[PDB]
Design a protein around this ligand. Structure first.
Ligand SMILES: [Cl-]
Ligand SMILES: [Zn+2]
Ligand SMILES: [Zn+2]
Ligand SMILES: [Zn+2]
Ligand SMILES: [Zn+2]
Length: 517
């Protein structure tokens, strides 16, 4: 007689996972992980992120809010808040205390900068908060933001201790199940044998050579190569080191398994919601880039871990009784050096320099307050004190930025809709522009250009950063594939529709009807 629902839904985000990681390594995946999602669920192969910039924090926020930065407030991992006169980190919250650790900078985090509800909020609202809602990630923002404003818990990793901790936003004390998991020192176990390729290194024929100009270093190791035999001694000295190993993902998923058991997630009929961000694909990607043996081996290892993870769910909840979606919060470019190695257009993409010229032109210093997320913020204080017009300073800076080489478009964020920019870029710039927290000028780079000179990063509209995988499996989901276009903001309404719960409050997207069986 009740609304049909799965006992559990799991939201998996593989950080920095380009859609084509699914297929470039398809031949080397086992049958139980990625290939299981493809072979028993539904894959949307033409999903794009419908805002810029495609940086950290926003993708996680947008996945779970169905919303965009203009509305939901998460304008970047960091942003310049003019009324605060300083940069702000997305989850930093001075009014809470660390729980499980003594580090303020590690534990003083909360979801308070988030203006819109999440699908996890709406599930709590729909069941009168009898739902178990738990977020897990190594990184704070990727746990906190998906889990929303009133989950059962949200846990992230403490680099100073190797523990999973939280903040007093959630509870006064770590739950018993967390203390137990931490006392097993799973991280020490996982890296004890160093990091070697899971397969024999000569079979990583989808990666470049092992030693290349454009890859960075991991530990005392001073060459970008396997094997990483120093991993155990280096891990005890910097516990955050495990982030940049596949072991970071294995750790995350065992913690998630513990969350399931610790909270009795998915045993009764009240739907529960687990969110898991796999952060190590990003760390390793940032350091080595998408064509590296390191990244490939991370995805082969992640694949095995997901096979195990899905088998644990089969056992603990029952096959068919849970709903999983897997996506990414962004892709990533190829390394600049790798692109140069193969003749692809690329390059590297300012405050001190541009301020100097602005003083020699307008007669005031520190006119630019900040330059981040491909945006320029002008210092509203200096403008008013020096009697200067925002538009005149903005016009000089734009004319100056145009002649840059890496620059495709530059526009004032007051005048996006009338600029001569094609879709889908124009609407993505709108969707990403937060009036309170975003800069006064928007910059769009030429294809293939990057902002660190090793590894890679993500931020642009281009398909390599914006094209994300999206796979559903389990309860309510038919098997199949589609190349119809969809947006990152369509995931949360899909889950909402599947659960027969109200959409998140800032949602702009629509349910992907073809996955619903
Ligand atoms: Cl990130
Ligand atoms: Zn990310
Ligand atoms: Zn390498
Ligand atoms: Zn339940
Ligand atoms: Zn990243």
């Amino acid at each position: 007689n009740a609304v049909p629902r799965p006992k559990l839904v799991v939201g998996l985000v593989v950080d920095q996972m380009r859609w084509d990681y699914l297929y470039r390594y398809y031949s080397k995946y086992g049958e139980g992980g990625f290939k299981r999602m493809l072979n028993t669920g539904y894959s949307l192969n033409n999903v794009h992120i419908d805002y810029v910039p495609t940086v950290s924090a926003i993708g996680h926020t947008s996945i779970f809010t169905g919303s965009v930065p203009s509305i939901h407030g998460i304008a970047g991992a960091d942003w310049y808040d003019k009324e605060l006169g300083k940069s702000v980190y997305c989850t930093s919250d001075e009014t809470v205390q660390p729980v499980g650790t003594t580090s303020n900078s590690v534990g003083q985090h909360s979801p308070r900068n988030l203006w819109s509800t999440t699908v996890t909020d709406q599930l709590g609202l729909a069941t009168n908060f009898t739902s178990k809602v738990v977020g897990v990630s190594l990184a704070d923002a990727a746990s906190i933001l998906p889990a929303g404003h009133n989950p059962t818990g949200a846990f992230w990793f403490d680099d100073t201790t190797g523990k999973f901790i939280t903040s007093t936003y959630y509870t006064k004390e770590l739950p018993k199940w967390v203390n137990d998991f931490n006392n097993k020192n799973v991280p020490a176990q996982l890296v004890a044998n160093g990091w070697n390729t899971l397969l024999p290194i000569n079979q990583y024929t989808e990666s470049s050579e092992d030693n290349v100009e454009w890859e960075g270093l991991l530990g005392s190791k001073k060459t970008p190569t396997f094997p990483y035999t120093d991993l155990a001694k280096d891990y005890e000295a910097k516990k955050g080191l495990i982030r940049t190993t596949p072991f970071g993902n294995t750790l995350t998923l065992q913690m998630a398994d513990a969350a399931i058991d610790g909270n009795q997630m998915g045993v009764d009929d009240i739907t529960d919601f687990l969110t898991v961000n796999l952060a190590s694909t990003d760390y390793v990607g940032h350091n080595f880039g998408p064509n590296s043996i390191e990244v490939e081996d991370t995805y082969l290892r992640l694949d095995r871990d997901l096979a195990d993870f899905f088998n644990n769910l089969d056992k603990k909840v029952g096959k068919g009784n849970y709903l999983v979606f897997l996506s990414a919060d962004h892709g990533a470019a190829h390394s600049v050096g790798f692109m140069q190695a193969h003749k692809m257009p690329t390059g590297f993409f300012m405050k001190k320099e541009m301020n100097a010229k602005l003083k020699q032109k307008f007669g005031a210093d520190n006119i630019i307050a900040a330059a981040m997320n491909y945006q320029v913020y002008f210092d509203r204080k200096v403008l008013a004190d020096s009697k200067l017009e925002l538009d005149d300073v903005r016009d000089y800076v734009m004319t100056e930025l145009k002649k840059e080489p890496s620059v495709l478009y530059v526009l004032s964020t007051d005048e996006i809709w009338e600029s001569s920019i094609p879709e889908p870029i124009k609407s993505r710039v709108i969707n990403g522009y937060n009036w309170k927290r975003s800069g006064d000028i928007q910059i769009i780079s030429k294809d293939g250009y990057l902002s660190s000179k090793k590894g890679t990063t993500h931020s642009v509209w281009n398909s390599y950063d914006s094209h994300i995988p999206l796979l559903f499996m389990g309860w309510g989901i038919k098997q199949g594939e589609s190349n119809q276009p969809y947006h990152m903001t369509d995931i949360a309404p899909t889950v909402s529709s599947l659960l027969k719960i109200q959409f998140p409050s800032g949602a702009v997207g629509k349910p992907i009807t073809e996955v619903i069986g």
